[PDB]
Amino acid sequence: GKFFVGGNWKCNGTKDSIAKLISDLNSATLEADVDVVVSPPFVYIDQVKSSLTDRIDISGQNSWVGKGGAFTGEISVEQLKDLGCKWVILGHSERRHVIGEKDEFIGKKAAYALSEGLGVIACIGEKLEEREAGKTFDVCFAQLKAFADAVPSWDNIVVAYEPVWAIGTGKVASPQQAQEVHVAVRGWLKKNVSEEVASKTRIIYGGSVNGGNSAELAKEEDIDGFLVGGASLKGPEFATIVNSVTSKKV
Amino acid sequence: SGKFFVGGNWKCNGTKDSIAKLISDLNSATLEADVDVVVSPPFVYIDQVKSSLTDRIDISGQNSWVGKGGAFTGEISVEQLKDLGCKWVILGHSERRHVIGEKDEFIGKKAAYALSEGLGVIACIGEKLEEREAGKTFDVCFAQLKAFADAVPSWDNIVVAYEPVWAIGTGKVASPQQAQEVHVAVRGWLKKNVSEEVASKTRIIYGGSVNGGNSAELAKEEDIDGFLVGGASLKGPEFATIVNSVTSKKV
């Protein structure tokens, strides 16, 4: 499967800061064999689609579980597509653990998004209390099962592993610990979906990724790319992380 | 003693093309002068609406995050709503309370934050059918109000919207009389728990089923100060007529 780098801007940016970010992304020279995706806040998706190079795809940060209608404050898959999105991020750790979105709810969001023709960036990952109880793979496999029990197909799914236990806990995750989770996620796909899906599905790393560690991470056999957080807000650094694909080739 | 207020909540509806037509119909309408008019597009269309809609109508977000932006994937901050030109945000809407599950203190915090950052707040309250039938209409509504009151820095830029959630789809229907009974109690609650000044200046608007066939009638009730319109706000000419239903309140 082809190297994938997405930037999750989260709840950050204004018209002006995003205009500068877009200008920097457009000026960057990006390597050829990489799928590149950015994920603006809902309100800026129009601005980004109007001015960002079409070499980069656009993702929503969330989407409603089904068709639109009486869901005040929510955005539908139809509306994301209408605005030009090709992806949606679903089950991001902040939506699981800050908002409180549950697994089956997330699984349903994905099935709907995939059946309506969006790609899905499907996020999984365990918290500190969970890892400290030896439940890393139990947690991730239940999250995967909830996806697998619901989705019509894995063709347009990218799996993102987030080490929530490292994200802000003062703990840091090594490329070895990352590789360990990715290779297990791939094995779960082999045994619970199929061998074909396991090899063609991209498993991207969604821990702390920056210009100083992307080259090292890209070397791991089962890390197929990144879901970048804070660094995705800095155009040149994000471009360099995208271009870390060359490190996977060396 | 407050100016008539009519908001249109588009909820999770619309595309570029339908919203472009809605905006044209809204722009073509002649709206009565003594009314505050507000529309609330889905997040992704707020930019499109701000670019083309007459400045006579204010724009509202349908929700906002509880505090400053940052690591909250999928959420929109008050800073961003303001950046796009919104002057209002709807908070504690029944669909966010009962479908999404947002709790009172959380909603109260959202409103306090939005107001401190300079947005007006349409603060929604209302009881479910099970609650109404057990005699807890005012327990629920007053508790929802206390949660706002305990948090907000001021009531100057607050509009209270009462939603009869008990009628919203439950097969029951709400009359202007039943709405009036709730609104008069809410205003009384404000008199005793905030001040007489706030009670008389605060708009308390009706957020039940409002359409071109009942708005003139609803607008006649003494303590209904306007509307938070659902389905009808997607039909421009009908929304305009509802705004102009203010003439019914004078007659």
Author numbering:
A (entry chain A): 5 to 254
B (entry chain B): 4 to 254
Sentences from the paper on this structure:
Triosephosphate isomerase (TPI) interconverts glyceraldehyde 3-phosphate (G3P) and dihydroxyacetone phosphate (DHAP). One or various cytoplasmic and chloroplast TPIs (cTPI and pdTPI), are present in plant genomes. cTPIs are involved in glycolysis, whereas chloroplast enzymes participate in the Calvin-Benson cycle. The three-dimensional structures of AtTPIs confirm that both enzymes assembled as dimers with asymmetric units containing two monomers that fold into a canonical (β-α)8 or TIM-barrel. In conclusion, our data indicate that the duplicated TPI gene from A. thaliana has suffered two evolutionary fates: the cTPI isoform is susceptible to redox agents, whereas the pdTPI isoform is resistant.
Crystal structures of cTPI and pdTPI were solved at 1.7 and 2.15 Å respectively. The recombinant construct that encodes pdTPI eliminates the first 59 amino acids that correspond to the predicted chloroplast targeting sequence. In pdTPI, residue C15 presents an ASA of 2.8 and 3.3 Å2, whereas residue C89 presents an ASA of 8.2 and 8.5 Å2. In the case of pdTPI, DTNB conjugation indicates that this protein contains 1.6 cysteines per monomer, this number can be associated with local structural fluctuations or breathing motions near buried thiol groups. Previously it has been shown that residue K84 in yeast TPI exhibits breathing motions, since this residue is located at an analogous structural position near pdTPI-C89 it is possible that structural transitions may transiently expose the thiol group of C89 to the solvent. On the other hand, pdTPI was not inhibited by addition of DA but addition of DTT lead to a decrease in the activity of this enzyme. In contrast the addition of GSSG did not induce a significant effect on pdTPI activity in a range of concentrations from 0.87 to 4.3 mM. In the case of pdTPI mutants, a Western blot signal was not detected for the pdTPI-C15S mutant, whereas the intensity of the signal for pdTPI-C89S was similar to that of the wild-type pdTPI. From these loop 3 residues, the only interaction that is different between AtTPIs, is that in cTPI residue M83 makes a hydrophobic interaction with cTPI-C13, whereas in pdTPI residue Q83 makes a H-bond with pdTPI-C15. Our structural data suggest that the H-bond interaction of pdTPI-C15 to pdTPI-Q8 is responsible for decreased reactivity in pdTPI-C15.
